[PDB]
């Protein structure tokens, strides 16, 4: 009956011994239970969860550094530290025999590609992707699940990740890990401590499955903004990698290669109707965008493009041409104008650098 | 029915009477009954947990010292505590149970020495971390009345180990939930009490279970967040950090070999010498624990492996001059303000 379905689910997987023992016990208990009862469907849902988890299924990982570097460099400009870390991860997974897992943390100012690089890394490694956002959450149940005794019990987001991704090689992104709750309603950072332990992660048990799951071959990537908020044992468990900002040159390269093309794709405009030269981009960056991230530059580019597109749909023009002389018309008054207050230093003044 | 389960045990009187009453109540009932299912599951659990059987724990001081020294390095007060445990278990002709607590900075080996202590004493090992746990159900269980009820973590541990006197390592005993939902600290205060271990009385089984032979170990990062009646029940043992020399011994004996195995390299492909390791520990890994030194070791071997695979080289050599482009900028500077002091300035050292 249903027991045959569960056995046929389990056949392809390579289950460990304790899991197979628990499954045998549960099938033996289900065999002698009347369908009209609620114990029956409690046990049936437990067997559902126990068999829907991929016990040995691993993704077919890409181990070609050429292809990995190509896919890694066709979606984000800089980030040499991150790209090198991923390439070394690949080289190690190849020099050893099998897949492996790590616990990384990307930290840096807002606007750099801390969140957007994870999906690219997943596509590069040909691993499965899953984004779990812990910003402000206080429910430890979202990490460890609830016991079976309760009515609407569920295993927790990590086990649901494994079930929904059908492999034990996912790239789990934990977004805004320094903004987690830590309140009267719960302190999920401690469960996160038990989850992201480089040595005990091999046997992590949530409270729904009383059996431990091997999360050692899972690529965990936490993204934080500041570090002093993360507690000391977490900071110890993770490998902090700094993703700094960008200088004007890198911002210009980003604008030319990704930001402006994507903004054009969104607004519908092409290079004929509205053209942004490299020189007006350099001027825009110099005069308006002096942050580490690129979100402000993205907003300024889309501002220029909306202003252009509004003249097209009405009768103001058929093509808009942006020059370093009429940039104030689009993005407004410049923000950064002059750097020196003294062109010739009098006897008593001296120019020093300051961070 | 299944009294052979008790034949392979030595059960006490009260649980025997409970099993007999429940077997009668099972006999006078019929199948297809909710009460039949409840009582059958109850007898299943009751006769599942072991009742008088112990593991034949090792009691050889030299063998235990060898197996304890093989795994870690220089946790001397912990190893002495375990050896004294064995000496007492020898002078008294029976098994023994204690309640220890290891507290110290992160990465010093508190959670890692427990499995080695279990290997030494030939006891069974259970971890059961409690970080962030909120509900008492995980310690004590639910009554038989509820559908889907089952005993707590301790009774499931007993059933799984199939023996009393296992070793239970309750992690993060200072990070237990004390918020709105539940307060399992009182359950732990009843469980880790040496005068009430002999009758534990979880909620599912109405019988009391003797837990006096279980060797409990609880790891904590700070004792401040442990309530005083609970600190007063544990033997607080401080696991302090390691100095540069102990860190070097750890790196040579454990860290670098394990990283070699995890990265697929050997000594001939990438050579980490004692002097470059000393320099790494001095300029980068200036902490109390070991995880950061392990991270640096993995970093060096990993960049080595990438250089080899990409075809750049076939054998990497990490020298105290070539270390910079492997681990980055040194977190601490070896050069001092004055290698030769002029008049007026004198070198003093502080704390
Ligand atoms: N080097 C880059 N190349 C191309 N696009 C980039 C680059 N850096 C950032 N971006 C783009 O800029 C935006 C950055 O957003 P992202 O979510 O990565 O920032 P974040 O660091 O996660 O911010 P927060 O601090 O809020 O988490 C994304 O749209 C991303 O596509
Ligand atoms: N003396 C030692 N010899 C060998 N390895 C050690 C030693 N001390 C620590 N380690 C290593 O440190 C790693 C992690 O240590 P562990 O996680 O047990 O520390 P911890 O006290 O649990 O930290 P936390 O308090 O943050 O949980 C282990 O893999 C262990 O091998
Ligand atoms: Mg983000
Ligand atoms: Mg620990």
Task: Explain what you see.
- It is classed as hydrolase.
- Keywords: AAA+, ATPase, protease, mitochondrial, lonp1, LON, hydrolase.
- The entry is titled "Human mitochondrial LONP1 with endogenous substrate".
- Chains A, B: Lon protease homolog, mitochondrial.
- Organism of A, B: Homo sapiens.
- The structure is cut from a larger assembly and holds 2 copies of chain A.
- Chain A is an alpha/beta fold and 355 residues long.
- The first copy, chain A, has 2 domains: 65-242, P-loop containing nucleotide triphosphate hydrolases (Rossmann fold); 248-331, Orthogonal Bundle (Helicase, Ruva Protein, domain 3), CATH 1.10.8.
- Chain A contains 14 helices and 7 strands.
- Chain A has helices spanning 2-12, 17-31, 38-52, 65-73, 80-95, 116-125, 141-144, 157-165, 188-195, 232-237, 248-267, 278-288, 295-313, 327-331; strands spanning 102-107, 128-133, 170-175, 219-224, 239-242, 274-275, 320-321.
- In chain A, the strands form 2 sheets. Chain A has a 5-stranded parallel beta sheet, sandwiched between helices.
- In chain A, strand 3 (170-175), helix 9 and strand 4 (219-224) form a beta-alpha-beta unit.
- In chain A, helix 4 (65-73) runs antiparallel to helix 6 and helix 11 (248-267) runs parallel beside helix 13.
- The longest helix of chain A is centred in the C-terminal third of the chain and has 20 residues, at 248-267.
- Chain A is elongated, with a radius of gyration of 27 Å.
- Chains A and B meet through helix 3, helix 5, helix 9 and helix 10 of A and helix 3 and helix 13 of B.
């Amino acid at each position: 009956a249903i027991e045959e379905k569960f056995r046929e689910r389990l056949k392809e997987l390579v289950v460990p011994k304790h899991v197979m023992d628990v499954v045998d016990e549960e099938l033996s208990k289900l065999g002698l239970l009347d369908n009209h009862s609620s114990e029956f469907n409690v046990t049936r849902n437990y067997l559902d969860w126990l068999t829907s988890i991929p016990w040995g299924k691993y993704s077919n990982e890409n181990l070609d550094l050429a292809r990995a570097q190509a896919v890694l460099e066709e979606d984000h400009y800089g980030m040499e530290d991150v790209k090198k870390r991923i390439l070394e991860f690949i080289a190690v997974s190849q020099l050893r025999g099998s897949t492996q897992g790590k616990i990384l943390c990307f930290y840096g100012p807002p606007g750099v590609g801390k969140t957007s690089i994870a999906r690219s890394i997943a596509r590069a490694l040909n691993r499965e992707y899953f984004r779990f956002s812990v910003g402000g959450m206080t429910d430890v149940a979202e990490i460890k699940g609830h016991r079976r005794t309760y009515v609407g019990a569920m295993p927790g987001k990590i086990i649901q990740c494994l079930k929904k991704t059908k492999t034990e090689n996912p790239l789990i992104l934990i977004d805004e890990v320094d903004k987690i709750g830590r309140g009267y309603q719960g302190d999920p950072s401690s469960a996160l401590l038990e989850l992201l332990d480089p040595e005990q992660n091999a046997n992590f048990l949530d409270h729904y499955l009383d059996v431990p799951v091997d999360l050692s071959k899972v690529l965990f990537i936490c993204t934080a903004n500041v570090t002093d908020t993360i507690p000391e044992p977490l900071r110890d468990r993770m490998e902090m990698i700094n993703v700094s900002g960008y200088v004007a040159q890198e911002k210009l390269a980003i604008a030319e290669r990704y930001l402006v093309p994507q903004a054009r794709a969104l607004c519908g405009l092409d290079e004929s109707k509205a053209k942004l030269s490299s020189d007006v981009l350099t001027l825009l960056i110099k005069q308006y965008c002096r942050e580490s991230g690129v979100r402000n530059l993205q907003k300024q580019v889309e501002k220029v493009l909306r202003k252009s597109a509004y003249k097209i749909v009405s009768g103001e023009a058929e093509s808009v041409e942006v020059t370093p002389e009429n940039l104030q018309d689009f993005v407004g008054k410049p923000v950064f104008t002059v750097e020196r207050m003294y062109d010739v230093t009098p006897p008593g003044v001296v120019m020093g650098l300051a961070w």
